């Protein structure tokens, strides 16, 4: 028995982009999940298939702590049965998802005067992602009938676009760090 290394996930200095969302695989450890839900730092805390207080009373093998950065108005897409650029092309949760979605505003960390363009998202994709699928490809998206041949332009767009995170952006356009906990339920 030992506490889960959740500090390394939530209190990480830098977060991965949503298209390359990082996954932390943790064994069946113990953690006061009731304290996490009762943390004032988390503005979004939605659980599916299980209550936040009854998380310790679950029987599972591995818990996955997926983490990434999206904007404010896209947090609604980190939920089962959602559509949009994030849910279809970046990070997709299954319909029978068992776990919780945690998010909080990170404007003070991920925004920079003049714009922070380090965080990216997949804008073009031929098909929707399967649940828990990750796509880091940088193939030039052929939106036209003519092949691109690794040359971008009209009808040939880079599938990834950078967020424009400025401190003066609206709250719907400010960066939000998201942590998704999933359980390989036994």
């Amino acid at each position: 028995t030992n506490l889960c290394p959740f500090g390394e996930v939530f209190n990480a200095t830098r977060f991965a982009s949503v298209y390359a969302w990082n996954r932390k695989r943790i064994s069946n450890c113990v953690a006061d999940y009731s304290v996490l839900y009762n943390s004032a730092s988390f503005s979004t805390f939605k659980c599916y298939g299980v209550s936040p207080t009854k998380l310790n009373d679950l029987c599972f093998t591995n818990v996955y702590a997926d983490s990434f950065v999206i904007r404010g108005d896209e947090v609604r897409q980190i939920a089962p049965g959602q559509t949009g650029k994030i849910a279809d092309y970046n990070y997709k949760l299954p319909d029978d998802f068992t776990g919780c979605v945690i998010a909080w505003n990170s404007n003070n960390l991920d925004s920079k005067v003049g714009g922070n363009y380090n965080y990216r998202y997949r804008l073009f994709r031929k098909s929707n992602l399967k649940p828990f699928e990750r796509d880091i490809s940088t193939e030039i998206y052929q939106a036209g009938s003519k092949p691109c041949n690794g040359v971008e332009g009209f009808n040939c767009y880079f599938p990834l676009q950078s967020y424009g995170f400025q401190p003066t952006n609206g709250v719907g356009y400010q960066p939000y760090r998201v942590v998704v906990l999933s359980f390989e339920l036994l």
Partner: antibody
Amino acid sequence: VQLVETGGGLVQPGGSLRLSCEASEIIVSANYMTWVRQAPGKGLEWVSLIYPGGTTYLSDSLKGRFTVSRDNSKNTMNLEMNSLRAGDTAVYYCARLIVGGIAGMDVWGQGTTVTVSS
Amino acid sequence: AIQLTQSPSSLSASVGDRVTITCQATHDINKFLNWYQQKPGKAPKLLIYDASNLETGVPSRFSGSGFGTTFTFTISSLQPEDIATYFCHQYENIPPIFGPGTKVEIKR
């Protein structure tokens, strides 16, 4: 690029009409495609939008009656209009809107005239 | 729904003058407003995207500015071939709604 609308005309009220949108130079199945109508003498009004992964969206005044399908064999955009009303009489354009602020991406069609009257 | 208030509906002026069109959004759309130009009987053509970026091939006399809720569409020197109807459209909040429109005429 060339977008040509067809399948319009006149239809009795409450009838069904299928608008076609033949597309050259671009692949339909892998693009954001929108249908936008403009009533005679009125302004523009968004009708529908389809993502390059299938994800569709409709207006509130048209939800449950219009349907945007896509066809890769003919590279044609399709807009099926059921339960047509007098207020649906307008000119419909199929366009590939600019997504992500990429210049040169936006392109519109010629437009087709739909007349819903008896 | 985000209602766009584009004013005025008609600002007839002479060739060579300055044009100023204001568009207001009910909610916050950040910088994602597109300005389209529509000739009589023709399809709309994109002039300004992201409220401040000129499109490919568009003459430089056109310009845009503004973010959040209020946006401005400016023609540095009004021209003969610039006579059309101009709409503002937010495209990142479904349902995307156009402006009422501005019928640009000429005084002479």
